[PDB]
Amino acid sequence: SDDWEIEASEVMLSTRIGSGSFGTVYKGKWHGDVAVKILKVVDPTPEQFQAFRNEVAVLRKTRHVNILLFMGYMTKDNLAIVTQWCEGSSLYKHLHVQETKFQMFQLIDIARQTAQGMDYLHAKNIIHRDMKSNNIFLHEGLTVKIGDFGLATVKSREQPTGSVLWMAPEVIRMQDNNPFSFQSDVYSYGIVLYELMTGELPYSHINNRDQIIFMVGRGYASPDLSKLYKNCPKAMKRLVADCVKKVKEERPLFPQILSSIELLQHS
Amino acid sequence: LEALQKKLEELELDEQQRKRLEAFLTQKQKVGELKDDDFEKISELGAGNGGVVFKVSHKPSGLVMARKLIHLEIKPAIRNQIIRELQVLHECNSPYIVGFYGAFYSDGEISICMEHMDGGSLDQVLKKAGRIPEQILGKVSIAVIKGLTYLREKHKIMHRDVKPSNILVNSRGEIKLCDFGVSGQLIDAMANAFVGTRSYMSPERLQGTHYSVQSDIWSMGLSLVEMAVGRYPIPPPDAKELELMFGCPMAIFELLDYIVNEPPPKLPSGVFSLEFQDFVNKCLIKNPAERADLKQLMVHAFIKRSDAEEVDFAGWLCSTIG
Ligand SMILES: CNS(=O)(=O)Nc1nccc(Cc2c(C)c3ccc(Oc4ncccn4)cc3oc2=O)c1F
Numbered sequence A: 001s002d003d004w005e006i007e008a009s010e011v012m013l014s015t016r017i018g019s020g021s022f023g024t025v026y027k028g029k030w031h032g033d034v035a036v037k038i039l040k041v042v043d044p045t046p047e048q049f050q051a052f053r054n055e056v057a058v059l060r061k062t063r064h065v066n067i068l069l070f071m072g073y074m075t076k077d078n079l080a081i082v083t084q085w086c087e088g089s090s091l092y093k094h095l096h097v098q099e100t101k102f103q104m105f106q107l108i109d110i111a112r113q114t115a116q117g118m119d120y121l122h123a124k125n126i127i128h129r130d131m132k133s134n135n136i137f138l139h140e141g142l143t144v145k146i147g148d149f150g151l152a153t154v155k156s157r158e159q160p161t162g163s164v165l166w167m168a169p170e171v172i173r174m175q176d177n178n179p180f181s182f183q184s185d186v187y188s189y190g191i192v193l194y195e196l197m198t199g200e201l202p203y204s205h206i207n208n209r210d211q212i213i214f215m216v217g218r219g220y221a222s223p224d225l226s227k228l229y230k231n232c233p234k235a236m237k238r239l240v241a242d243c244v245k246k247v248k249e250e251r252p253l254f255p256q257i258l259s260s261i262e263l264l265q266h267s
Numbered sequence B: 001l002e003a004l005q006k007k008l009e010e011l012e013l014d015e016q017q018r019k020r021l022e023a024f025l026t027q028k029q030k031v032g033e034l035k036d037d038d039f040e041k042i043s044e045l046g047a048g049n050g051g052v053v054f055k056v057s058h059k060p061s062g063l064v065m066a067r068k069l070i071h072l073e074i075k076p077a078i079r080n081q082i083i084r085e086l087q088v089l090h091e092c093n094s095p096y097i098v099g100f101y102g103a104f105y106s107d108g109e110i111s112i113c114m115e116h117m118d119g120g121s122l123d124q125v126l127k128k129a130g131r132i133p134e135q136i137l138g139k140v141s142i143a144v145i146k147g148l149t150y151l152r153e154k155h156k157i158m159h160r161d162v163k164p165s166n167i168l169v170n171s172r173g174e175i176k177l178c179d180f181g182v183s184g185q186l187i188d189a190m191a192n193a194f195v196g197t198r199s200y201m202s203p204e205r206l207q208g209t210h211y212s213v214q215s216d217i218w219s220m221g222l223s224l225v226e227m228a229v230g231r232y233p234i235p236p237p238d239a240k241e242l243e244l245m246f247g248c249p250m251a252i253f254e255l256l257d258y259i260v261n262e263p264p265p266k267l268p269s270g271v272f273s274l275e276f277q278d279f280v281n282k283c284l285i286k287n288p289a290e291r292a293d294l295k296q297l298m299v300h301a302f303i304k305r306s307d308a309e310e311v312d313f314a315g316w317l318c319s320t321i322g
């Protein structure tokens, strides 16, 4: 194939980390610790084989310290992608399971690094299409790594896993054939910003996914910004609101988001 | 143990039902606290509906069970509270409610172990039967109407998710409800962790206004139509598709928007009885106050007809799946 295909006898699968509907993530060993995402597909069609090598080609173009390091793929026995192993947990687990006590300067740093990675992807014409705090990993706690981008080619193939909490209204309504854009990614980044600056998920008082889908698509519901931390800088509060705006064209792009954070960081 | 049997005698059972309920409670006493190591996998009985479900054998007892794996990332306090709130299912013993054995948390998944049903869900039954005969949809209606009133009187609970895949059936002709909202923390957890392709949600619940068991009646009516014809009805059938099922897709938001704005679906006239049509029309009233409630449904003409009709449900089921 190309020189990033990995032979299966070289990889030793260890423990099971996560398991969605589109695949399963194992910790493994391949010249040190590694992560293997194995796709739940036993009869991969010539069509799905091509979409996989296409999404692998996109993964092949990313080399950045805030993007999860692609390392190789497997296409014979099964469809899988091998990446670096992050020693910390995902940002979701930090904020919503362990409830780790980040300080304000660390929340801004996570925000800035995430924006740094997203800026890189868009500069390479990559749209994440599914950004949440589940997909942001803290390698050893200090540096964020963005993953679970790509394979939107293969994901589009009753009640599966996934979430609506990070979906832009234009993406929820799905009225265009392609509602995904740099600003739909900005909205998702905005919701991650909300998580960072409140400690909890949006729409915490609504417990009905179908209510959330309807209410957010109509404009009757939006993240409650009154729950932002009191120590949250007032410029950061503006940035949450700017990224979360209902209008797709009113949202900042990541060069501006970066600058907003960088000038804030100059205390 | 016998506190469970005292609550059996507070119900209006017949001779064959008390036999089976008493036999299930004695099997509940064979099993203790459940764990992942205690189970041997047999087959797979489902993939959607909020988690994979396996047919399994509990080694110490020998019992066959259904094990629902619900994957959720939640802080340990919520895990323990979800298992605490699920223990009310030990006290949910009714002919119209599937049984409970125990619940526990392992790996990153809440395991719920419950009564096995060899007939499967009416969702699974429908895709083999094409459409469900009306005589049987009468018997199914009774089971649902009775299970909802059992929950509201003996437990003060709503189902919150009445759909074809949450009605299960037995080779013994039993029709029971499952996957109802016992744990408030589990309700919150599964809204954030899953996505939906279709909806049986009442328009008042979609809009955030006050709701009651009337929302479940709306869901029953929407499920009955979907089982009568062989298709989800939110996008009403084409003038062609109707003439392709009896002879002589929208995204989730567009569905939810349709359920709120456009008139409710109806049973196609001429192929079904008039009372059954009036029955679903009384279930699919948008305004909940003028929608039929549970007592009116039990005295509606369609139910008194169906309750008297002796049907071989168990027979039809084993004929259409095997
Ligand atoms: C779509 N409606 S919603 O209100 O938004 N969400 C929910 N609706 C219902 C329910 C829930 C959550 C929930 C689920 C999914 C469940 C599944 C199996 C189960 O086991 C069992 N065993 C024996 C007998 C009957 N059940 C118990 C269960 O209790 C719950 O609270 C919603 F999250």
Ligand SMILES: CCCS(=O)(=O)Nc1ccc(F)c(C(=O)c2c[nH]c3ncc(Cl)cc23)c1F
Residues within 6 Å of the ligand: A017, A025, A026, A035, A036, A037, A059, A067, A068, A069, A070, A081, A082, A083, A084, A085, A086, A087, A088, A089, A090, A135, A137, A146, A147, A148, A149, A150, A151
């Ligand atoms: C270069 C990105 C490849 S991806 O976009 O397909 N995503 C992907 C592929 C394979 C994976 F294993 C993962 C993944 O979930 C993790 C990668 N490294 C990790 N470290 C810790 C945890 Cl909990 C999870 C992961 C992952 F996000």
